[PDB]
Amino acid sequence: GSRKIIHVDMDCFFAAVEMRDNPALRDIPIAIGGSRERRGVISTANYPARKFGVRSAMPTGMALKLCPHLTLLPGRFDAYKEASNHIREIFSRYTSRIEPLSLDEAYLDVTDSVHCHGSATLIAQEIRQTIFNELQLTASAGVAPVKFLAKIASDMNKPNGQFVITPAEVPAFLQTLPLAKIPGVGKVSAAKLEAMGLRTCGDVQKCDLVMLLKRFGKFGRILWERSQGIDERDVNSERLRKSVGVERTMAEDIHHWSECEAIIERLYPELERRLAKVKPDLLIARQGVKLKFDDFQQTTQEHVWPRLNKADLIATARKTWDERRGGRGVRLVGLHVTLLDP
DNA sequence: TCTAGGGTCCTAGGACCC
């Protein structure tokens, strides 16, 4: 009962789309992100820009100090979305067991595919080809017996490549796998783990499960499992959006409620529009707001509420402003909704 | 250099129920 799992992952996604649509962007360093003056960060960068050290999540300020000729694009989301719709129609030609993780990424469980003589490797290659014809965008892929290994595999041979891991390669693959490459282990976790001489899955193999649950709860089980190649999570295909939010970071910290209110007036129409798309009657489970202060502490307050409603979001924001700002400057105001359950 | 905006999932206490 080995499953055949594919992870497909578009190369340089936003930047690739911008380079296809404008060829002159191809060989010069580019990134999608907001300007330095807008306090922006980098969404992604093309390869000529990564060469300079530009990365996603990097303050644009730093990107420019690292790469002064950086061309900065604002991003065209409908174009990325269009591409994402296309690559999912392509997957559906191969299986209906498709679990998208974002615009540019999806798991596929092809275990029971009678397609490329049942070869998970050919299906992958054939998906990547056909995405490139049809879209002029390259993708990379990872083939493995479980979700997370397929994900790690998809990074191993990018851009425009793939990587297969068979059950037989699994133990050698894990011995040296750093924990930080496990999805769900980021900076903080990696540092706590490294603080106790745990760097690889091989280090974790040697640990006791009881102590691991004691010092991490459910996370430590997951760590213990994945360190062993164990990942019983099924490719889902039935997931639904749970929430929607709209937030803006000001060029300068605000200090007056009039300013906050004015921000909210512009945020609201945008949230209404985006919600109307998926819930015309605007019916919801919870609505609330978000402030982030100059000490980067962020606070949210949200409450049960039957329908998107501007005035209540403003009143809630005023309470929050008045009750938990303690004279700090404010860098960010946000609106938020929790969707109904079914 | 100076730290986005779109989300998901998990944890933890009190309310509330039984």
Place this chain on the structure above:
DNA sequence: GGGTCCTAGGACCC
């Protein structure tokens, strides 16, 4: 005291 809902917040992903 165990479920589960409510609200707040953190880590992480893309």
